[PDB]
Design a protein around this ligand. Sequence first.
Ligand SMILES: [Cl-]
Ligand SMILES: [Mg+2]
Ligand SMILES: [Mg+2]
Ligand SMILES: [Mg+2]
Ligand SMILES: [Mg+2]
Ligand SMILES: [Mg+2]
Ligand SMILES: [Mg+2]
Ligand SMILES: [Mg+2]
Ligand SMILES: [Mg+2]
Ligand SMILES: [Mg+2]
Ligand SMILES: [Mg+2]
Ligand SMILES: [Mg+2]
Ligand SMILES: [Mg+2]
Ligand SMILES: [Mg+2]
Ligand SMILES: [Mg+2]
Ligand SMILES: [Mg+2]
Ligand SMILES: [Mg+2]
Ligand SMILES: [Mg+2]
Ligand code: NA
Ligand code: NA
Ligand code: NA
Ligand code: NA
Ligand code: NA
Ligand code: NA
Ligand SMILES: [Sr+2]
Ligand SMILES: [Sr+2]
Ligand SMILES: [Sr+2]
Ligand SMILES: [Sr+2]
Ligand SMILES: [Sr+2]
Ligand SMILES: [Sr+2]
Ligand SMILES: [Sr+2]
Ligand SMILES: [Sr+2]
Ligand SMILES: [Sr+2]
Ligand SMILES: [Sr+2]
Ligand SMILES: [Sr+2]
Ligand SMILES: [Sr+2]
Ligand SMILES: [Sr+2]
Ligand SMILES: [Sr+2]
Ligand SMILES: [Sr+2]
Ligand SMILES: [Sr+2]
Ligand SMILES: [Sr+2]
Ligand SMILES: [Sr+2]
Ligand SMILES: [Sr+2]
Ligand SMILES: [Sr+2]
Ligand SMILES: [Sr+2]
Ligand SMILES: [Sr+2]
Ligand SMILES: [Sr+2]
Ligand SMILES: [Sr+2]
Ligand SMILES: [Sr+2]
Ligand SMILES: [Sr+2]
Ligand SMILES: [Sr+2]
Ligand SMILES: [Sr+2]
Ligand SMILES: [Sr+2]
Ligand SMILES: [Sr+2]
Ligand SMILES: [Sr+2]
Ligand SMILES: [Sr+2]
Lengths: 56, 46, 143
Amino acid sequence: TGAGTPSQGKKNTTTHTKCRRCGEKSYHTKKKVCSSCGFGKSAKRRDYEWQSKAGE
Amino acid sequence: GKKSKATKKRLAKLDNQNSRVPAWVMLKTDERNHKRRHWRRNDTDE
Amino acid sequence: TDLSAQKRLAADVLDVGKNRVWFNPERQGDIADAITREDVRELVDEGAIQAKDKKGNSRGRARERQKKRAKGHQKGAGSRKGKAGARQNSKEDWESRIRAQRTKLRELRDEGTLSSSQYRDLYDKAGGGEFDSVADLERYIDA
RNA sequence: CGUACAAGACGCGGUCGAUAGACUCGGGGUGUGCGCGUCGAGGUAACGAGACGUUAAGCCCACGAGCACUAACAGACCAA
RNA sequence: CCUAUUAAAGGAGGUCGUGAGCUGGGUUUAGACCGUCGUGAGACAGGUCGGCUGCUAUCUACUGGGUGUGUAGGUGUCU
RNA sequence: CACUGUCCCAACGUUGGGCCCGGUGAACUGUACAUUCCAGUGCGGAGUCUGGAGACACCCAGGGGGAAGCAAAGACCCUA
RNA sequence: CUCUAAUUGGAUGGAAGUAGGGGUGAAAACUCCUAUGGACCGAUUAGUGACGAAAAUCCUGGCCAUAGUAGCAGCGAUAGUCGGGUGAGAACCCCGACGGCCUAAUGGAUAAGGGUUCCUCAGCACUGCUGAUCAGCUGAGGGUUAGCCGGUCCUAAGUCAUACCGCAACUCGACUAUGACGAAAUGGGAAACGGGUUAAUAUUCCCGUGCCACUAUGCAGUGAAAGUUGACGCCCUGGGGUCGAUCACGCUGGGCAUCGCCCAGUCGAACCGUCCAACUCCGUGGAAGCCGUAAUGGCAGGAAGCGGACGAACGGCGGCAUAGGGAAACGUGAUUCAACCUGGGGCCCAUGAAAAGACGAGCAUAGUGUCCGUACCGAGAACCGACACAGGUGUCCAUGGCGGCGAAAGCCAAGGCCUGUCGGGAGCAACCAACGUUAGGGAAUUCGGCAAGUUAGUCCCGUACCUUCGGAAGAAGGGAUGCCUGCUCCGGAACGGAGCAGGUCGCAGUGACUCGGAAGCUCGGACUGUCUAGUAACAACAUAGGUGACCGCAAAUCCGCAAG
RNA sequence: GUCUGUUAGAGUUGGUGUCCUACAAUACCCUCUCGUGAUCUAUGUGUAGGGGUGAAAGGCCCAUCGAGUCCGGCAACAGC
RNA sequence: UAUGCCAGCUGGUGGAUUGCUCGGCUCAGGCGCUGAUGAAGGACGUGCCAAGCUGCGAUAAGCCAUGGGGAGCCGCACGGAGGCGAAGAACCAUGGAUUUCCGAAUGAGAAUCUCUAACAAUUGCUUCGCGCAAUGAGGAACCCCGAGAACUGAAACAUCUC
Ligand SMILES: [Cl-]
Ligand SMILES: [Mg+2]
Ligand SMILES: [Mg+2]
Ligand SMILES: [Mg+2]
Ligand SMILES: [Mg+2]
Ligand SMILES: [Mg+2]
Ligand SMILES: [Mg+2]
Ligand SMILES: [Mg+2]
Ligand SMILES: [Mg+2]
Ligand SMILES: [Mg+2]
Ligand SMILES: [Mg+2]
Ligand SMILES: [Mg+2]
Ligand SMILES: [Mg+2]
Ligand SMILES: [Mg+2]
Ligand SMILES: [Mg+2]
Ligand SMILES: [Mg+2]
Ligand SMILES: [Mg+2]
Ligand SMILES: [Mg+2]
Ligand code: NA
Ligand code: NA
Ligand code: NA
Ligand code: NA
Ligand code: NA
Ligand code: NA
Ligand SMILES: [Sr+2]
Ligand SMILES: [Sr+2]
Ligand SMILES: [Sr+2]
Ligand SMILES: [Sr+2]
Ligand SMILES: [Sr+2]
Ligand SMILES: [Sr+2]
Ligand SMILES: [Sr+2]
Ligand SMILES: [Sr+2]
Ligand SMILES: [Sr+2]
Ligand SMILES: [Sr+2]
Ligand SMILES: [Sr+2]
Ligand SMILES: [Sr+2]
Ligand SMILES: [Sr+2]
Ligand SMILES: [Sr+2]
Ligand SMILES: [Sr+2]
Ligand SMILES: [Sr+2]
Ligand SMILES: [Sr+2]
Ligand SMILES: [Sr+2]
Ligand SMILES: [Sr+2]
Ligand SMILES: [Sr+2]
Ligand SMILES: [Sr+2]
Ligand SMILES: [Sr+2]
Ligand SMILES: [Sr+2]
Ligand SMILES: [Sr+2]
Ligand SMILES: [Sr+2]
Ligand SMILES: [Sr+2]
Ligand SMILES: [Sr+2]
Ligand SMILES: [Sr+2]
Ligand SMILES: [Sr+2]
Ligand SMILES: [Sr+2]
Ligand SMILES: [Sr+2]
Ligand SMILES: [Sr+2]
């Protein structure tokens, strides 16, 4: 069985969903953690300096 | 699938949001819904 | 005129497969104006809308064959497709036979024809497959 | 319409006509039709695989002949 | 190399003609074994089993078929 | 051993394409020029240079000889 | 070439730019004329630079040839045709007839996922492999109704939060406590059936009938928690038994018309009541060889027989029902029996969940039963795969008829469809795909019998070497096979099976379909099993078996910075 | 961890067939192997990047694997 | 002369060019904290007709007061209908009202909803009662305290360097 098209047909699982805290469709309903703002993981908001160029 | 009351409100909004730009707004602005969506061609969140 | 909607409604009111409703070729206009189920029933009453009959396969030919075979015909070597044990389940056949032998022996005992120990002796012989059938058993019993 | 042919081309006939089809003969292919009658191992009977006769039958033909019945009509145009 | 026939069963060139013609047995990836070598990873101008063959032809080339112009109304036959 | 179109050696037929017509309608590829052929020459593997030969233009179909055809800045080899 | 400054000019009596054209300069370039344009533009000097392009498989945008070319054929699903309707327009939108296609699916119901794709009206610029009046498209409206179907409640592997401790530290980290979270088809679970109704909902609305829980009141009751249930693996199997299917006869209706056959229907729930086989047990009885099974088995530690207690169905029976449904009749018996119920046996170096809950624990009447989901698709067009993709995608309908061993083939119902959606022409050439048939020869072909073919179902006879005694073996080899008439045997019987005698047709009787070619020698790995998703299925990995090593548990081995 | 078997379902030996600007960035057809078990399968759940997972093929960890993906270091460095 | 080549003309296609600037880029000056009195952010509502943006929050392109302002107005947005304004509207300044749900998110739970009174959790004070208080999270960068690479340079490379 190929890894391409054949294996795409099996994809009907719901993981990432609208996040109650930031509104992005990044709340992983199985992990219960927003990969965007980190809701459900961090009381603080998910930030990272690499999300931008070093001198900016 | 099964939808929660909230998921329904959202889908509901996305449905109303999917409308024509009122005929009159085109006159008032002396001559497009850039967010127009299709159930098949597009994909909503969730 | 497009009568698809009506066909669907008529299939539900006449309650038959959609493919069996007949619409009179000369009354499309009227059927076309039919909007509600009531309109359809009305048209059903008039006969403009009807349901063709469902089919049922004939078993006449099968019946003839069923007789020939019940009479023991059409089962020669050239007609058999399944292995012998498949045409007649052996364990099943044995259950049939041994029960018929044990019953026989049971009637012959309460009937006084066989003493308890005579019955016992035959019963165990039966259980050991000493008799091919009820008739074979009786033959033996007649010493 | 084919002695020709993937388009195009090529060839033949067009009532001063057998060019194609229908029809009928001929020449062919199968192999003895439907129905009916008799026979048929048997079977009370019903029923009955099948045999014989009717039947060199029935069915069929990209071929030939006869035959203007149908269709090649009506008619338009170029041209030193 | 070998066998039977044969008049004879010659040799060579064409990108060792010919894979946008074929085949894919040998060679020469990724798997694996053996022998030898190597402390080892692994190797071998050794052996062995398995292991893929893309493309709608633009030009040119040729095989066949047409339409035009030239020679300059036509039919037929020729050279 | 058996069997056979694998072969001697090919033939006929079937279905879908192919071909013609309506409609729809891409891509690959493109320095330029380009009707070539035989020789030669040249960075020693030329439609384009030289010398000859041949060549009226355009179009249809074809199987792919050539364009060291198209496709991917060779993965072999060496070098860093 | 840009913009700045100073000096100095041009422009609506027409600036810049652009197009075509004239003149100058070796040249970079300068300048004029005409048209267009319709508002800005220079020169000199000194500065300022994101200052000059033919090239980078350079970037972005636009455009041509390619070309009216390829594709719109190939898949075991070849599908249409003649009339007519609507319309400005009809091969493909609709009606009818005729002709076909799908049968574990091309039919029915659903999970996930999608999200309005669902229904109606009005449309065809867009989407649609051609067209379109059609549509999953466009515009506008509308549609999802629950005490008893899910969720909700329970706990599963496991997850998180808090506390504790670690960490330089945390959004990080293991344990231990606590709490919570974790099952929508498909784990457990209080209770709903039948019919009617709409364009679209429906055990939800309506009609009829029923049921459960909690609470209130009244009567009863003092029992109330021991126990039972929830609650369970794999293999074989008996008994009860419904739907279905079939057989017999009757009734209602339909079809066919030389016959006298063929088809459909003959209905009716939940619930309430009641019946009880098996298992278990008790009384009686008194077997020292009897009782019993498909099989195992049982017994003086008390067999059979007889009586009794407990005790089953989604099952029988009565009610429900002068409910409902049907144009009508509005059956009765039988066989085989899915479901469902209840037993017996065998297996394990394997032992087949938990919790909430329920029963235990009465009856009346009344009140309450909120919240969330509910449309549609579920696929060769509604999901994922960029697509209206020949791929992928869970569950159940596994009992419709013939056939046969069969949930096989083939054919046909119920139901669905002609949308695996471009058509029209040419005996329709070459060539290609996928096939059919080929005389004689018969592997000569080829690396190699690759490809194709041969054989084939069932019964009888018969069967070598070798062997771990299991096997080898369907070895090989040989024979039979239909139909019709009348019968025999086994069985309670089958519309079950096994045979006999006579008759008889064909080239051919597993007549299609279904359906092994066989034998020997050698190499390898013992075997079933594993693997390179996408060029390797093998001799490679695994395996049981064999062996060696470490360790007495505050152990050996291993993870973590630590807490662990 | 038996046999035959397109029962369901799992797989894929050969055709080096069809396709190879595909229906499809792994598809189609026939043949073939497994089909009561170390079986197949749905959902839920766990293991995470020098780390998992692996009946071991450097196999697999979302078309990506002899060290995933994203962004950042970053305008890395190169004698090519 | 067909098919055709080169240049131009008329008309397309295309959007370069010139002109224009509601946007950027950079520099300078000023100013500078918000949040359990629930912020920032997000969701969903909210208009006569309303999809986007903006505003606002069930009092929902707004309500109140004071001052300004002024004959007009009903946002972007040039429509239609209708309405408001001399009871001084619109508009502006300041102050106040209202301010759904999720969100540090704090009664428990949850993909923005649900379930049966709540400073959850950790603290200080303590009338030992959550009675009174505190912390939490946000912010363009700046700042302080900790953890801390590698590519790179050295023409290799390990200290060093980055
Ligand atoms: Cl039993
Ligand atoms: Mg037996
Ligand atoms: Mg060569
Ligand atoms: Mg070649
Ligand atoms: Mg090639
Ligand atoms: Mg090719
Ligand atoms: Mg000056
Ligand atoms: Mg430039
Ligand atoms: Mg071409
Ligand atoms: Mg419905
Ligand atoms: Mg389709
Ligand atoms: Mg040879
Ligand atoms: Mg008998
Ligand atoms: Mg050898
Ligand atoms: Mg093996
Ligand atoms: Mg592979
Ligand atoms: Mg071992
Ligand atoms: Mg260095
Ligand atoms: Na979608
Ligand atoms: Na070569
Ligand atoms: Na069509
Ligand atoms: Na059957
Ligand atoms: Na400030
Ligand atoms: Na306190
Ligand atoms: Sr899935
Ligand atoms: Sr967390
Ligand atoms: Sr951070
Ligand atoms: Sr899609
Ligand atoms: Sr090869
Ligand atoms: Sr001339
Ligand atoms: Sr060709
Ligand atoms: Sr520049
Ligand atoms: Sr083009
Ligand atoms: Sr077709
Ligand atoms: Sr095909
Ligand atoms: Sr039109
Ligand atoms: Sr529809
Ligand atoms: Sr729960
Ligand atoms: Sr359930
Ligand atoms: Sr099972
Ligand atoms: Sr039974
Ligand atoms: Sr439904
Ligand atoms: Sr499918
Ligand atoms: Sr049918
Ligand atoms: Sr179509
Ligand atoms: Sr023949
Ligand atoms: Sr050979
Ligand atoms: Sr040979
Ligand atoms: Sr034989
Ligand atoms: Sr695999
Ligand atoms: Sr097996
Ligand atoms: Sr191969
Ligand atoms: Sr083949
Ligand atoms: Sr391929
Ligand atoms: Sr098998
Ligand atoms: Sr970078």
